[PDB]
Design a protein around this ligand. Structure first.
Ligand SMILES: OC[C@H]1O[C@H](O)[C@H](O)[C@@H](O)[C@@H]1O
Lengths: 226, 217
């Protein structure tokens, strides 16, 4: 019932602008300050901004140098954060949060008692690109997998045998390569006795590039026959 | 400035975890005897969740096994009877001023008995080699603890700067980790050498384990 649903964000080129939004339900929106908080590798968890109940007063982290701007539309239960002149240090996960607190002569004091799901913001010049999918061919337990290489932006999803195979699967977090493209592998361990009789197919979906690949992973053949 | 310690803690299910938060400036207000400190829990892939306010007051819904304590500049969160869902990163946060800040986080993981990795090596596929690149993948599967060293040797020369690693989150059921290490070379460089090996060191292994192949076999 009570929740914050975030949208927007995604990829943004260096120096460009990006809008984030947050939709509130299940509580009286105009009774609360709202804040934005991000999580980045270099700066950890960082409060960015708050905005008062009626939207007339805003406060920002000075380290942002005025580059961010918060607003709210109380009639529609929305709060917004606009990022400007984005820089690489702005890459991270951004959260809207309900800000539960009080005001006195000295300022505003509060905790964050309800949070949105988070939106990833990726500052990068890279062009959208679908992955190449390569088999990691097997060989009483065998390992096999798929290498999902050279895509942008995150995320990719990997399933095995259309979701029929989940036990023993490990899909690794993507790593960013020096090219600005991501790579990951997905592996699964299975009985050696199943190789050759059971089919193994990794299903890779990269929605940003409209890419869908189904790659059969077969045991490597050593003869002249095949 | 809020400094948490330790940076990470491994706790056996059912046992007690204690996380510390030290503030660079007093956050006890003399006039109301309150400490302006909150604690949050962040499970993997989720937003932080508020657990404690005023250093020791659990918020509605939070079970007694989460206990906040401390005063002035030294605070602690104690988790008794640790449960699987308590594996998370925990953060403190002060609200003594209008510029709120968080500690850097303490990661709490589930402790278990050492498990050695099963180690697998994959040559590049012929498909990839056609495109002009060679990725060699070393897999370390289902090990504990997380700490492991993986070294690539190509015709017995230690490699540096041409591999990247990735590690899974702790497995929900067996509490192990898996790790991939990927060596990336040009097709030309790959074909200059015969023996490709990944050497794995892990507390669960008496001596390093090497998995290798000869190119073309
Ligand atoms: O092993 C724990 C780690 O798992 C994965 O690498 C996650 O991406 C990372 O956030 C987490 O710290």
């Amino acid at each position: 019932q009570v929740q914050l649903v975030q949208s927007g964000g995604g990829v943004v080129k260096p120096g460009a602008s990006l809008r984030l939004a947050c939709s509130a339900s299940g509580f009286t929106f105009t009774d609360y300050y709202m804040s934005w908080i991000r999580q980045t590798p270099g700066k950890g968890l960082q409060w960015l901004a708050y905005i008062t109940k009626d939207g007339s007063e805003k406060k920002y982290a000075d380290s942002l140098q005025g580059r961010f701007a918060v607003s709210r539309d109380n009639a529609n239960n929305l709060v917004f954060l606009q990022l400007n002149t984005v820089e690489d240090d702005d890459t991270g996960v951004y959260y809207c949060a309900r800000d539960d607190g009080y005001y006195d002569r000295s300022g505003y004091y509060g905790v964050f008692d309800l949070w949105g799901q988070g939106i990833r913001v990726t500052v990068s010049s890279a062009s959208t690109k679908g992955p190449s999918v390569f088999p990691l061919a097997p060989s009483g337990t065998a390992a096999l997998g798929c290498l999902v290489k050279d895509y942008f932006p995150e995320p990719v999803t990997v399933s095995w045998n259309s979701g029929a195979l989940t036990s023993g699967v490990h899909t690794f977090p993507a790593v960013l390569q020096s090219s600005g493209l991501y790579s990951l592998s997905s592996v699964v361990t299975v009985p050696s006795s199943s190789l050759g009789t059971q089919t193994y197919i990794c299903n890779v979906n990269h929605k940003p590039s409209n890419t869908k690949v189904d790659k059969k992973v077969e045991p490597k053949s050593c003869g002249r026959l095949v | 400035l809020l400094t948490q310690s330790p940076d990470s803690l491994a706790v056996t299910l059912g046992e007690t975890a204690t996380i510390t938060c030290r503030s660079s400036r007093n956050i006890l207000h003399s006039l109301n005897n309150k400490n302006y400190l909150a604690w949050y829990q962040q499970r993997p892939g989720q937003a932080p969740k508020l657990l404690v306010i005023w250093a020791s007051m659990r918020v509605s819904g939070v079970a007694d096994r989460f206990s906040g304590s401390g005063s002035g500049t030294d605070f602690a969160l104690t988790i008794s009877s640790l449960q699987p869902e308590d594996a998370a990163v925990y953060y403190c946060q002060h609200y003594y001023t209008t510029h709120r800040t968080f500690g850097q986080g303490t990661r709490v993981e589930i402790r278990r008995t050492v498990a050695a990795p099963s180690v697998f090596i994959f040559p590049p596929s012929d498909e990839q080699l056609k495109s002009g690149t060679a990725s060699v993948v070393c897999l370390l599967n289902n090990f504990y603890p997380r700490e492991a060293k993986v070294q690539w040797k190509v015709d017995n020369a230690l490699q540096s700067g041409n591999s990247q690693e990735s590690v899974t989150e702790q497995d929900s059921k067996d509490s192990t980790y898996s790790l991939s290490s990927t060596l990336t070379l040009s097709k030309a460089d790959y074909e200059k050498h015969k023996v490709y090996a990944c050497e794995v060191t892990h507390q669960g292994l008496s001596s390093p384990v090497t998995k290798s192949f000869n190119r073309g076999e």
